[model samples]
Target: KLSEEQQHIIAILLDAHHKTYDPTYADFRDFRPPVRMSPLSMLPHLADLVSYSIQKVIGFAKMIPGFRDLTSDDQIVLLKSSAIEVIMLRSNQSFTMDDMSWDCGSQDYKYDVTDVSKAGHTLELIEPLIKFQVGLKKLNLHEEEHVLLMAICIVSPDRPGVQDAKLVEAIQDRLSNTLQTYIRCRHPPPGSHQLYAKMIQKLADLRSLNEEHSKQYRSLSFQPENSMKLTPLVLEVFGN
Candidate 1:
């Protein structure tokens, strides 16, 4: 078992995470009112949604002891580079493994006109997205597991012009080590180590998803001729 202090820190970190940052947070809503029935449906409103979601994700990431110590400029730059990847991972929490549906509160939204594949570039994302979701479901990740997964994405050393690359890397390393430790402590079985290895493998999948998001953004703009820009907040998430 983890020490008291270690467990407390994990609890605090988990609490700091935005309940709505991941679909699982909204997975228990009943459709009686049909409100929030499809949290996944909100992604298309990415401009407005990103404004709300991205900031919350950053707020959660900043809960780490050293993250808030970075200069504001460095902070913004790091998020620009990382949040797209993190958001994609978070979205997986509610997306269905079948790719033909999405988890909405307590329901499964069947394929519809809003299907992401309808968008040309987004069409390329389905197979990988489904595969990633399937793999993640196999892990049966807890909230704590997802938090560490997201934290690793935010604590990057490769974001352009970080004020102190070494310090950032050090924080990331510490977080990664802690995440691995948590996984081991929570999962103690014959093949549990494979679960740890598989979770680590997701870092690569996130990069691929980030790439596809960029393509999707470019391929689908909002009233471009009308100069209806994709607000800075949205662009920031995708590194625009």
Candidate 2:
């Protein structure tokens, strides 16, 4: 069994995750809600949705054990760099392998690749994202593991503008170590180590997606026309 503190860390993270992202968040709603709309018209709604979820991710970030101990600027930088990645990670909660679509788990809304392209995303970023989601879902992570992974993602030390790298890394190491031990205790043997290695690799894979997303998002959001369409929360995080 993990020491009391380590077990508590998992408990804190798991509780925060569920409050922000109940799998049942989306429940019975009209099945015929506008599932399709013009690209120009739909882009704003999509951006708003993105902003809404980003707020949830931010809230989740704040609840991590050591997050508030970092300087406010460092906290901002971490969220700026990693919020989208977390969103992509959380998307798996809503992702359906059967049809390969994202069900918003709100209003019964769903999206596919064509919808992403229509909303101004390029295949360069979206393609690999889909594949990454597919691979991560295949891992069949328990909810606790998923929550710990998200916490680890936000506390990354190497994000471009992070100061206090050592402190951030310390937090990350604690999280990673706890996750490993948790895996050992909870999962079956033989593949336990392999699952840990694969999960770590998924974090690395996520870094690439975050970089590409930042690039595409910056380009799209900086344009004078597109800027106004997005929510202020979107601009504050991703804009120049």
Candidate 3:
């Protein structure tokens, strides 16, 4: 049985995950791509969306128990290192296994690898992103499990810039145990046996994805004009 505090964690995760940007894609929906789909046209909107996603990740982190206990610098460090990875995990909600595309919750805006290509992203990052989403989606995880996984990833003590690894590790271990208990009882036999381990493996996959994403993003930002298109928040968190 989940403790009362554990139940509260679930509620927080669900609430934070539910929040979405009010004017998402509103500014750029009508901006048509050229025949060749210039990176300039697509980069700004993608940067806008990425910045919005970072905001939500911060919102989610602040609500998690023990996250607020960390010093301000530690909080920023943890978030800076993990934001993109969590964003990728959160993207699973909109991923469509049927077409292997992300449904941006807007008409005619579903994103596949090719659409990302227009934003100057290559297969190195986007391909693994879709593949990771597909693998995670195939697990058929409940929303509770999915959000808990994201929470777990956020407080990871091993992220490069962590200052207080002990406390972060303690917090993460509790969430991990809660997830394990939740899975063992709620999930059916056989499948439940390996579910926990498989989830940890997905986090490892996300780390690799994050590395490639940051590498490509930094490379893109090398162009002065391209850097101008990225939002301030995106630049602060992902900029080199």
Instruction: Give lDDT tens digits, candidate 2, residues 114-201.
Output: 7788778888888899999999998888888999999999999998898799999999999899889889898776646588889989
Candidate lDDT (C-alpha), each: 0.65, 0.83, 0.80
Best by TM-score: 2
Which has the higher lDDT value, candidate number 1 or candidate number 2? 2
Weakest lDDT window of 10 consecutive positions for candidate 1 = 27-36
lDDT of 1 by residue, 9-78 (tens): 5776687775435545342222212213343343444344445567777887778657887778777777
Q: Report lDDT (Cα) of residue 65, candidate 2.
A: 90
Tell me the spans in candidate 2 whose CA falls farther than 4 Å from its real position: 26-37, 105-108, 190-193
Model 1's alpha-carbon lDDT is 0.65
Candidate 1 residues lying further than 4 Å off, grouped into runs, are: 1-5, 18-47, 98-100, 106-114, 118-120, 219-223, 226-232
Return the candidate ranking by TM-score, descending. 2, 3, 1
